[model samples]
Target: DQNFYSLLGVSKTASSREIRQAFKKLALKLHPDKNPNNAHGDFLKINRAYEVLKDEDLRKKYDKYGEKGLEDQYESWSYYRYDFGIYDDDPEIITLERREFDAAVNSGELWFVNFYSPGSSHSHDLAPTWREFAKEVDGLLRIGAVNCGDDRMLCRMKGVNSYPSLFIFRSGMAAVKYNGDRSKESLVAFAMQHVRSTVTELSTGNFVNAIETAFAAGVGWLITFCSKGEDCLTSQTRLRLSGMLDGLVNVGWVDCDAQDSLCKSLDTTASTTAYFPPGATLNDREKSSVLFLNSLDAKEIYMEIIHNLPDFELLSANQLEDRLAHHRWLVFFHFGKNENANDPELKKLKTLLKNEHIQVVRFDCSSAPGICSDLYVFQPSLAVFKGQGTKEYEIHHGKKILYDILAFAKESVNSHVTTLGPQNFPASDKEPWLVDFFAPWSPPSRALLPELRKASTLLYGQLKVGTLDCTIHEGLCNMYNIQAYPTTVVFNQSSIHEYEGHHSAEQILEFIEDLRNPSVVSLTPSTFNELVKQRKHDEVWMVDFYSPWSHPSQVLMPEWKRMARTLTGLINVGSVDCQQYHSFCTQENVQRYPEIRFYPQKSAYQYHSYNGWNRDAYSLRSWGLGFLPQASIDLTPQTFNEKVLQGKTHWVVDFYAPWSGPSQNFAPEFELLARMIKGKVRAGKVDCQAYPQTCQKAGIKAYPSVKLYQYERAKKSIWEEQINSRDAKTIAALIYGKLETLQ
Candidate 1:
């Protein structure tokens, strides 16, 4: 399908200048100077090929999208004739010869090329539907079908392996295969986007080149076409272009005598214009002057280019150091506009800032509030900053007015002395606030501002926060007797505390939120029992056994605190500084640091150990919630007799050593046994390694021993070990079978 270079009879890597020279030669030849038969048709085809190759932008577009991108950009090559059905009343179908197909697609417009075979019944049946589709697209999209029997080479070239294959070919773009909903509505909607007029350029002069540029730019609005033969006066916009380009300056129309087509083969067309915007394929016999699109007096035209904010790169905190280096005039605003191409506010902004020197950037304050906070932009605000200095004007609202913004821009290079002194500091004696005492030039001070600002906004009532210059506010810095350059002081009810944590938002938030209690309680033997007791019945105890020396253990400590905060009421989270609480860890047989063990509300002695789980807060919370219905008792030596044997509760006991090979494998099914028979039968596990005495007493000979017991009957021969299987279903069947035998 892509013989764009071949269409020009040039090499693919032909030089840009060479492409132009070749296209110009071809176009002039094809021009009706000799008035050859079909000279108009030949000229259209040559010009179409030339349009893309001539423009660097359009050529690149066609290079990637191949036919589809080109088709999307230009209309002439993309629009075709349909001779197949009554749909001929519309752009839906076109009867096109090879030269016409070449001219139509290459004319820098979007057209649908249907490859069909005469033998295919589906092809004949679908002819009218495509015509229906053409009517719906207005003139934006045109559809043409070629029978494979008649044009096998074209079908083969376009990669058609089947009959009734559809592909959309944009001017100078690769073909986009159509394999979707074939309904007229679906096709119309698709055509709208595919032919969406994004590039505001008209492609009249070098039609092929314009198509190439339009496709490369990924927007295809540049396609007006011509028709001939019968009463082919003019083509129509696929959708109402007037409505789409609403804010744009109107194009004034002028009429002039038009020369009809020289191609006696089928069609006639006026030589549109010498000033036809690149790739324009329409003939204006009326000689209507092309509406002065960009001919607006430079002030407004210039204004339109600089200000319309496309949603992209808003300078953020990380850009702070670099933005200062570049030092261009900057106007950052919070517009809260959607990241859409055609928001009206963008149009207004573009008009307002027409040809303005300052770069106006608007960001979504809600999404990037951190940057807003960093910029000290609280509301829908605007800030103008000069390179590497406070020589700037920051305005908040309409009260400041448009003239005020102009005045602010005019009042540039007027640097003022810093006023970030003790007077600007929050009255320290009032409600306590975190204060940053820093010099303006300090590297760390710049870094701390963003994090501090983030902390202040996230937690509203936690603490009042402020930043001050230590150079100007030496009175308070020395009053607090701070020797450091960037010292952080938190003024509390009675005293001020120096901030010594990570200096991150998390660390600051943790410090503020923990003004009451630490987010994670580091448990010693003393606090562990009381903390465990103070929890409500449903609250799970997640204790992390961690040594400060262990790496992952060190990493896991904060997630516990984070999980503590996130799933606060649902869990009582604490960590044993395992190095300090060896006895406490010894009691739980915790051999690894940073291992999380979940203790059910009733069982302080037994816990489910963590094994390669996503032990984050959400993961732990989601996981711990699953154990709410757990009724399995911890079968320790102390509770073994009373809870299991005395209560007459039927028991499926899992006797497994935690460290053993097969025993570890059987633990999940044993827990399943507990959940499956919760109300009637009790299920539990025994750590045979820790309670070998009990295992010996029960005549446990293997590492994995599953013992079944019923206290009511079979008293003499009451218990039997499941030597056959550790399978849950078989074990459950065995339990159910044993229970049923009493009948």
Candidate 2:
């Protein structure tokens, strides 16, 4: 029920930009001048909602404390709203007319100004706290007002569209909406915090009092007062130094021409620079007491502070043993006898080793001779060790130290697969390569490794094949925007192309070769017709009609692309994802869900439509290679023993009499089992009349018997008589059940 976001006509989940835009439109319409139709009554409340909702911290406070927190503890000011509790009684709050409003806001002084009008009880409610804040922060910030009733033009110009609004302004800058707390204490602190971010430019006005008041505040000063336009040393110096000392020290600049007397008293007539850290006393912080070198540069000052802290992390001696226990391979930097050992070259080596999950240590070899001697290192050296055997191999001093360690780390991991990571990625960019970014928990990411291994070995001379662990190198994964698991990227020069194709060695190799060619065409209205018509020879066109916003379509997109790539030059492919083309889909005679239509190359009038849409690309690819052989081979009198008996795998034999009654239905199922276990088993049928010796030699007691033969076991053949049903699933499961022992 309590909804300030509702006042702007936005949901509670409305973003900051949305609320700002909403408030902007409502405020303009409800301006006092424009809304003479009595719309100004709600103008102030709409304006106040924006200042609260735009700030995350303020919105949280508003959520907990409600509108009273956003509304209370601020001055109520109005030029035409004296009927309200207007602060004309407070001498501290500046009562500005429309004429004086611009000068007060943009006079190079800090001021908190308010806009309000009569017939508003909300502004009346905010009056008492405004007076208290005015009394507390009298000189710190100029509290002023514009009565929208008469000075509506001024209010509109300043964008005071919402009534009961407060804004903070400084000279040479536009007014900023005041979103801070309005309590006297909170208001005073906010003004001081704003003052800390800025560097005040001094002038003729206020003269000596400005310098005196700066010291009176007891804030430590880093003051500068010098710059000639053509040669601006101190001016540029102030700009840089003021930002550097922000929150730690206060900075302000003075022009000698404007405040000549103050500059003369401080003996800073032409130019002067001062640095006072922390404590403030008149003599210590005064310009006269500070040291003045002949010259200084801001860049050097920044670097000096940054270099003191170590950028390359250091490890303790105890953590060194723990690191070794955790990792499989490691390198440690021994800097006991050699100070120059921990140079940039070694640091770079340490970082490279870190990426591959190799722990490189920097141990104090001076304190631990026993540990060093045990590891076969007596002095400053780079030693590589393997965790499996606990063997330490030390690298003697060489000219190219880092290069040697690079080769060492590569050799340490299994050579068949290369593990690439961020620190070592630069070297990879030197050559064109394909790298995988994979997640551990993803099934597809792990399943693709054997295929990756085959491709990596084949592309060894052409492209460097490697992989990265997305689990550890998360930043690198996001850097490439790898959305799915088992992501493959081809690094060609500076360009990285992702592989959205299939994950087979043969299918992937086809992709690699076609990578150098334009293999897939994006079917658009202009090009969709001829691309399918040309279907080359007796080729076919598999067209997909899809919608982009649907989840199933998104899943199909990668698959559709991979299919087109794998079947390149064999079949033509494209889609009808009409963002604006419904007529085209209707002409194609396809409606609802996703439709994949096949246009036969030879037959122009005839086309094939799939009722059971296969989502996997392999099924389509397998079907593309036409004239597939029957999965089962025939066993004749001449070839019976040679084909069936000695394959060193399992053999399922069905010996049926020439006049068997169940041969009609059971023959189809025996072939189904043959096709299902094609790669794993050798299945064949023998007719009793054709292979009378082969069937009788196999120890067939019954006229129609199913026999099993496993070449690895001592018993060459097993005759089974318990089988009654010849269902494909049951028969397939039975063959697999026999394979448990055959395997």
Candidate 3:
């Protein structure tokens, strides 16, 4: 809270020159020569503030993070005498300070700001390259740098979490951060992404040469055939189209009046737009798309052009392997360049399976007959390649219908349930592999394939699914003793589980779920210490202390298991029989017939005995869930202003220090109370150790101080109450009572 600006008697928006002038005026009175009595303390504070504010970079760092950013920086204050500026003499680059940042950057001109620190080696390495980049884009955009060594606060406020950050800003648009290569070429290329008006005015002298050059570069052109006076498209519209289709295609315009002979050869008319794809020449108008002028809107014209664009991509033999490394592809193979890129059936199939995120591509067999021969695909075919270097895939054998192709696509993407062969077998020790041993000829095996695919997608990140085709891998199938046609087996490296249930997706999921979550945990002395006692930092365990011979214990055993399954994944449920380990139960002083104890989070000896009347499954589940870990927001001084003090929301905040023992013990109780009163009152915590100034301003005088802010919409003032009890239930009851009186 010790603001450097106030200390120097200067405003926060003061320039460096103004700050230095103000510091000189204060030093005249506080100097040791004039006032020798209090000069050491007062003069040193003013001098330190002036030193930080004089440099633009350090001033920003101190402004954002306060003195914390200058960690161990001020053991004793001395004047900094080293050379400070990095790009001080560079004419092309402007050294920007935080005082003039907003006005200069948002002045309707493109601006690129380099936020860099002095000590970082990469920032030093990038200086020469940045200078060259600034010289190249001198007239197009403005280049600036915020030296973070002095303006560290400005860098943090702009969300620069790393060193040497480069960002480009436009007049009211989002800032684009550059994370590409550090070369000047790549920097200029990245800046060129937002450039407008790239449309080349095509003339008769350069018409053929320009289109040919475009073809050589592997990009298409969206050309407009119009006269100069015609209202087909404006100059601004052409620039907009150029920026929109920058990398995908080149945008151009042609004047029919000036290039009459060239326009006549291509059969151009006034106000007609056309798209010529790569490898298509102007002489061959048959391959180009001629758009009849339906509307003058640029967006409508763009929509029509995108529709006429080719939707499917063509893959080469080498490109096929490269594409498979990233995406799962549905590839079509045909002979003699008979492409079906515009086939309505394929388009409909692709649109329906759009949510699956599969790539649709084709291979021309005439160009790569070697590829066709290796895969034994003689006729037209469609196959699915499940990437990640796996060679085994499914080839479509059904008729060429929309539903059949869609089924193939859905099953392929959904079939994370992998098909196992001799090449790639399951080798994981920890992840359990669920394998289906089957033959392709068996009707039962074919019937079970679809269900297995659905199961694989459901258990995607949890288990691995594999299917072994016994017809192909006969030796391995016989070695595993596959006597049946379709047998499902779960293989853990050390053991296996043979499924005896019916062949369905639901049954398989249920069978796997039962194996993972045990109904009730039987804990021994060693397991109790390892699983429950040591790890009670963030967990709640409900243990039953009982004797097997007692009748009340017999009645509660079945209900305890039912409650365990009901509260699975939320809390731990365990039981200990006194008859089995009498000495262990006696040491705990459990002399009752059936006693239920609850061990909560973050404490070693603190526990609660179950005192509720109901012993049903629903009651036990709700009780366990109430003790589940709850989340509370950690408040900073800024967040406290915006979220709690300004807003009308009720807040219960825990102000404490981590070093205090009472504060450490009260954290879990606050969390439990937060969950009990959730949605009605929000919870927050602030560490006094981290923000002592904030705590001091809030009138916090002791450790583990709990305060409540109840602000009503109708009232202007907030009512605050100090809670004294450390128990969660007592605090929760007080909040509920306050809420009831208000209603």
Candidate 4:
């Protein structure tokens, strides 16, 4: 068996640096300087393992062929023979395997996993306390243990670099690492932090304050009013019930003997448990429900209150903000003052999406006009917020059935697609966005939504997908000139391209891919002057003068475009059509049906005619590569954060991969652009191949992506603008425009 990772106490996915660090720490303990009396046999074996594992080529061979691949290169390796299974006899702590880890922990249950190595002294020291803690919280949360010694791959995948690391895994939540004291009491406190009761003991002085605060928090109050202590629920029962209905409602008890006036005002007598929803006052018992429980049992009382408890929270502006900070995703049901919490549909909607883990809330239009107006909800409607902030949310324009609402909530959480509105419409310079400007009522638009959703999933990283309800966002629709029902547009960098393809997933994906990997740039009569004639002294251009009616020109179109792709980073490739620009084509002395010319940057008037015998991609690439010289600074993961992200200087950075064809083509233009705005703006390139995490942090999806990081001095804020165009002039022009605005 392969035990190099186990011997070094490192994961299979451990980096060379990690392997070295592990070996160094192990060597220090077993070295002659520390262990002078003992034999250096264990140290010699680990040293040999480190030597073989550190080399990339040797490591691969060892991984495939094991000890045979090493072939007497080093001493035979062996690991520590300890009492291997520490928790094997402990029934409370489960020995979790890699295959069962995720499914077990993420089954809507809380799990506390102890990732430990049997060989670790610290792990052995804590084994007694860990087992005790597991027995204490066995039923509340799962107690799991993973032997990093045996399950190195699983430990590595979980980012466990050390032994005896504790992590709390919860369903639909990020795993919480436990870094506190490893004592039984400390572990109990940590576990209880998640399951603790929100029950409040009400006093005469703080009764009004508690009611108001609970109302503001958008939670219902389940208060047990009693003239005597024994007449009400037991203390333990209240605690259990409170934890069961934690965020949805606040459970408490009121002593009528102490606060007789309070009980009389709320029309409470004897021993009774009542639920007061948000916006209901002490005197407003008519709106509240009095639980007529047969017994003072916690489970029965909890069930009774839960069946009638408000399914949706009615949060104030600040309360909504606080909840959204942690919840991230929420579905708001817009309602009026007359809306009932007992509505069957509302209750059903909540039950359907319980596993989805999205916050179901109600926004009272009368109470919170700001949120209602901002979200464009005038009536009982539904809106979904997939992100942290409540400033932008997707309004559900479809029918408000339980099934439809459930689908909408699930779709919002599952897909990366955004529902576009005037408030949430993205800026042009981020990622390339494929937006479908459509009206929900339109048949064609309705029919194409599923296809749009499928395309969104397929093009998740490379392209952003969104839909705009044209009927609702009429102003934005008119601004973007959306005259049709289902107008598809791709917004990349500063350029926008209207997709003229069939409304299907395959066609849409093809259209986006083609745009991302364009070989020939379309040159308009006006754009030609700005790119070539006007910038003749600064740049070289390869132009294909073609006629639409000519057979030769039609045959050469595909080849010319292909040729343009090969010289991507070397020169500019553009096409000018004689069919529309007859006079402009003639002015360039292109009277011939199909003429290819190369405008040189050497002199103001110097130009070269392409007289190559073959008009293939290879010949064009060879000719173009012969003339080039290169300034964009290469940024690593460290420098990208230091110079571009954290620095005060405005920067234009290109995020690309050398292996990508579009990126290779766009590289030269980016370098030329760095020269154009040399001092005004800094130019940097992050090779995604070398620093994938940096690109990922920057949210780079497509290759050859250019972004302008404009720093605002007064605000100390930086804006990252994505530039989709391949022209250095276009990128520079956009950057210049942003600089002027910043000034």
Candidate 5:
């Protein structure tokens, strides 16, 4: 049996914390969720290690008894009783119902949300409290915790800021949260409030009854009062009163000249003030609640009366500004007094922005035309202000301007607010570079132009925006996969960030902002390529093997640029355009337009063609990133013989033809591999076309075959006849094992 410590890649003396840290690191990296097919085997090993190591008693038992201890301890103990047993191998499968599975997956788990200061000891003390709470609620809830002490990666992922942050999950979904202190009572109270029992749940009938109770209880009755006599008959006053009533409620009024007895009984002194509740003797019952509307002539008086009412929460212009300041968004709509001809476009825009936490302020701008002019150049333009003091930036101008602005603004906020980092834009290089790539006539591309200009102003200091007509610049389009027009590609200092698809100005700006950062800027082609080669193959590799002349390959370039902007380090993506090195293509048997290969370490390359390719950048990337092979086979050689051979410890030899496209493509990989293994291996290339005799001797039928020759006691020749596979990975694995054996 494999040792639990060895399986986890840890020493026997490793501490519990060390063990947990290692487990988490490996778990995240080798998670079945991320790796899918390739991960299951690793996942089993990981689980087996964690099961023993996670518990002190189990670990102790394992340490003392080893395999025997496991048998003795758990032989009588039924592992099938545990919840995790569902995943174990059992022919008598007790398959959980879909709802039960979901329930188990989404059980109320207490998760650590964030750590404001993980380095500090305060958070250390706070950490165990949650664990203790989880312990208390053992059978009742699932407790999962994460430590953000090392870095802010998890916190950033969850958008958590404060330390000791807790996210409570129910039914496999995040429900409530306790961010700061974890008082037992407060936590219980929160759980009680958010986690309702099956009974006492509010249904449609309950909601209706609640509404009825609110109305019948007269908790804060609102009544709109309009005068019936000629004393309040002026159209303007009447209109104003109607508008005011339309806006709010709980208003009452009386005419001074008509209904004198009714007025006296109600104690109504003015055209505006009217008593209805405890203050008035109506039906022999004294009421206190009364509404007063002195005169509609004074809008301030009407507003002030509404302000004093306890039940009313009047939102004034200043109040709107304050709310905007608080929430970081304010949506205002100007509806003129002519309500009959209300702008349907503006109404739609208001509705769209309303759901995004943007404050929608609708005002009758006709009341103050001068104010309208001061605020906006266009009469019915929709302007978006960053905050209270920020300058009002217009989002729309003509008829459907509001709707357009709202749509763009919603996208902008969603992308910017959710993603942490500097926005994307051009750098502060004062060069008039034309670095735009997009479809010539796409609306979204056109809409993003202003944002690009804004981003240029922010980044390039004083750079201008240029358009790349994908149709006209077919070469450039093909080079960058400009499948869709209007893909914005920034060019500064030879680096690029292409904003593909329909991205809002804010998203473009944020993308540019990220580009300006030194860390991100340093990831140039040279550095990126080196990093890719250096990266451990055990992770993931998304390789785009293409040729420059291939139209499809060229069309993928822009998409590649967009991918570079979005998915940088989350997945390692590299491109090898075959046109650059004809010899490289001649070596690898790549005859297609675009060949995407997923190369797991020491595993055969899984290849796929671009099908259903689109402007959606992520879909294209995910296709390549996903679908990994099951297990990586190690076919590395294990010995060396130098009697009839050259005295080379590590030999790198490529079997290639002088004619094939694949051979030319494989040439670069050969060259790169040679350079990489120069000191470690004796790099050599065997041209099958040039040396047909050697090719025939080695049985090299396929073009661009690769081999790694090492000495073996069984093989006496310089080049081992026993080692005879053309697979790059098999050769690499053979070489690796040979080197290890030599060492």
Candidate 6:
């Protein structure tokens, strides 16, 4: 119900540039994909505000009719149900409908499919039929078909060259292709198979099984064995038996001495021996026929039995390392029972894990100390893996570790890699090997090692964790640009790549899963940029353009960060540190420590500060006088170019001295005011220092002087008289006129 500008912390007079800047700042900060908690609600509000404000016509309509008018317009303009038939006779109508469909789909309504042609003739026939099929399903199902022919431009742009190409769209994401013929039956069945009617319609309980089914159908079956200590003999025998059943199939092991129950449930062991079928079985009795070996080597034999099974995925410590090399970041959290039991720390760790976008894995070091020991991690710690091939580095045993792992992950993802690394590392034919370069002295690394081990176990199951002492392996460190003490590098093809940074356990695990099947770029930069710009225009921009040499600007830096964190999406706030570009500040005629300016569209106004160095938060709040209720008490706008200004009784004005320190500090305050008093009152600002002649005419000697003008009827002439000698008390007195005063 509040003004959209007020909600996004922008002013009605904001220019397109300011609006765009503000939107980008807020969207990135509040995006639902980035911040999962309460993000959906915040994003919805952000999007709604953007929908009206981004479009010039829509914004004007919204200004006149408010949110209801915008709502009505949206409903009337909703072309989501329009049929996108390829054979439509009118090309113009089709184009218009296509454009509208794109917009609707982008705004999170409706779903679209863009099927184009390849060199193959199979695609030419299939693409059109798919579009027609989609159109027939529902008028709302928007489908577009582009003829690639020999051009291949459309196919290249969409990352498709093969025939019978299909893409499923949901929300804003263009999902991986359904990849088959687009017949009416196939199209309908594909929609039913992949597309959910709503988010709630997707069953969470069946998620794992569904994924497993998809994997089996697509990739194949994988078998792993977990047996250590007394069960070692059973596992070994099982491996032999499995080998006899099939061949030397890929076998994996998790020492039961470290994790007893983990492999038990995964293995087809009933009463210490069980079997599992590759596909659907009707009865429970049929499932029990699968055998799970009790001995250590039995896992190896069991894997052999399933060797010929289709889509089999197997990973050993070595193989995992190779798979992980392609990813941008990996987080290895080594933990045992001790660290997990530490509630507060573990909670923070989990929170951090929830936030990152990197691959994370947790290893129970207690269950497999041999692996941890081999990785050269003497204590529980975290490791960051970055770079490609042999040119990798790892930072291990860091200190003062925070739980916000996702933040670190984002930072790592955005960071550019400069160096490449430890060469001549041994490469395994079947799997990858990850070696960590760390020092024993790093406190953070020591504390995090346990957690890192836990994460590594989960992520790089097929990969061996190796460690090299940076102090001793100076050749390796120098080769990988390891200037720091604790670093991690992954070895593939006898070359090394640096490990970017560590992430939480969950993020690492998710990363590993995603690495198995990477998604090609589905959205173009132009589309992404357009969405960003649109979202930006719907919000308000509060920019602090200040010089570092300015004392007031220096003092306001902390407050700006605080405001940015507090206000968040409500108002897009940013600071232009003028110290880096002082010429721009000087050219702008900024002579004071803090010279404040508020631009509402083409109009620019300045705030006036009376006490040069004594400007506090109150005065700063007063600069953007209109936004604050109390700003009306002392500073009020009087005249515009000698003509009498006609406005509301409660006038909020800002008086700023261009050369004063307080005036410089008052800029952000005024910006805040523009956000606060957005639509409530008539707010204006004047520079007593900039326009000296006008200041002299108004008898404005002090820097900031606020006046209240009351309309008085004298005879036939109705004139507005200035209510002079006004303070908080006098202003309250004038409000009641002859009425009884509280004091």
Better of 1 and 4 by TM-score: 4
**All candidates: CA RMSD (Å):** 23.3, 23.6, 30.9, 22.1, 25.0, 28.6
For residues 619-658, what per-residue lDDT tens digits would candidate 6 score against the true structure?
A: 4333433332222222324464322244323344556586
Give the Cα-based TM-score of candidate 2 against the true structure: 0.28
lDDT of 4 by residue, 1-743 (tens): 43898889987666544675687668766765456576378777887888777654356446544674354522222222233346756878866655445545654456788999775475767988998998876545668888776568789998998988999987668999999999999998997787747677787778889889877766678888777645788787787777656555688988888888787777766787777777765464463444445568876776676666655666566666556545635556455553544444445445335666666776667777876666566677676666544333455654454434555566555555677777667656577888888776543454455556556767767777888887777998898887666777888775777664444556666556657788677899899888877764446788889875454675576667667765665578998888679888878789776788877766434567777788776776556644454567898888889998889999989899999999988877677788778889988999999988988988899997888898999999887777888887787788888889888
Root-mean-square deviation of candidate 4: 22.1
Q: Single out the weakest 10-residue window by summed lDDT for candidate 3.
A: 74-83
lDDT of 6: 0.43
Q: How do the residues 1-743 of candidate 3 rate in per-residue lDDT, one tens digit apiece?
A: 56888988777666554675677666766766667595768878887898777753355445434674453322212122112345665777866665446545654456788988765364658888888989876645678888886677778898887879999987559899999998999998888776654989998899888888887755678888788767666776676666645445678888889889888888665667777877664543563444444556666666566566565677778875556656677878889765564453354444344456667777888898987766656778887777756554556544375444665565755467665766566644567778888765543455456666667777777667878878667887886777765777876663565664544556666556655656777777677667767764557788888664454665576567778886554578888867668788887777775888778886445666777888776677667666666478899998987888886788899999999999988887788778767789999998999999989988999999999888866776567789888887688889889987866
lDDT of 3 at 89: 51
Top candidate, metric TM-score: 4
Give each model a TM-score: 0.26, 0.28, 0.29, 0.35, 0.30, 0.21
- Model 5: residue 298 alpha-carbon error in angstroms: 28
| lDDT agreement with native, every candidate | 0.53, 0.58, 0.70, 0.70, 0.45, 0.43
Model 2, span 183-297: residue lDDT tens: 6677666665555346777665653455566555433455566645422235555556555444334556676666776666666555655554333222323643454434456
Q: What lDDT does candidate 1 reach at residue 374?
A: 55
C-alpha lDDT (0 to 100) for residue 660 of candidate 6: 67
Off by over 4 Å in 6: 1-156, 159-334, 337-743
lDDT of 6 at 122: 48
